[PDB]
Ligand binder design. Sequence first.
Ligand SMILES: OC[C@H]1O[C@@H](O[C@H]2[C@H](O)[C@@H](O)[C@H](O)O[C@@H]2CO)[C@H](O)[C@@H](O)[C@H]1O
Ligand SMILES: OC[C@H]1O[C@@H](O[C@H]2[C@H](O)[C@@H](O)[C@H](O)O[C@@H]2CO)[C@H](O)[C@@H](O)[C@H]1O
Length: 129
Amino acid sequence: PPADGGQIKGVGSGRCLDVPDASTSDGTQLQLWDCHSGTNQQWAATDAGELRVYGDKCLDAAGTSNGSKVQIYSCWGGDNQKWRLNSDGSVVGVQSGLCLDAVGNGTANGTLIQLYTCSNGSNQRWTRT
Ligand SMILES: OC[C@H]1O[C@@H](O[C@H]2[C@H](O)[C@@H](O)[C@H](O)O[C@@H]2CO)[C@H](O)[C@@H](O)[C@H]1O
Ligand SMILES: OC[C@H]1O[C@@H](O[C@H]2[C@H](O)[C@@H](O)[C@H](O)O[C@@H]2CO)[C@H](O)[C@@H](O)[C@H]1O
């Protein structure tokens, strides 16, 4: 079946999880960007816990600590490519237990995305559209 990916939209910023310049390259760090219908803002949940983009790329935690980059890499089944959306709006990395976090409490276009200790601040709350 089709992916049917949807947005991951930040509550504090009103902006969407976005792969810069619609790049598909491994290791590309994510950012906030104005929400649009483009495929670089479409994130498809799977039963394996992934958030997929471009069919076979995965939202990817480069590490397990505060400030570790959130990026894309080809999907391969790693626990650092597994994510859970919680009732408090947090998107938590399964491996690390850390939250998707807009760096520095930034809201603007280009604000980078990292892992960070969960605080439930508005830069850590998300909706799926
Ligand atoms: O990174 C900012 C922004 O990039 C857009 O991609 C542009 C790209 O920057 C430009 O060089 C090219 O000519 O057109 C692309 C499509 O507009 C993304 O579309 C946007 O989502 C952001 O990711
Ligand atoms: O890892 C960065 C961290 O930034 C926090 O925001 C802080 C920022 O670090 C500080 O320079 C500024 O004076 O206060 C901000 C809080 O209002 C975020 O809260 C946190 O989630 C991380 O993004």
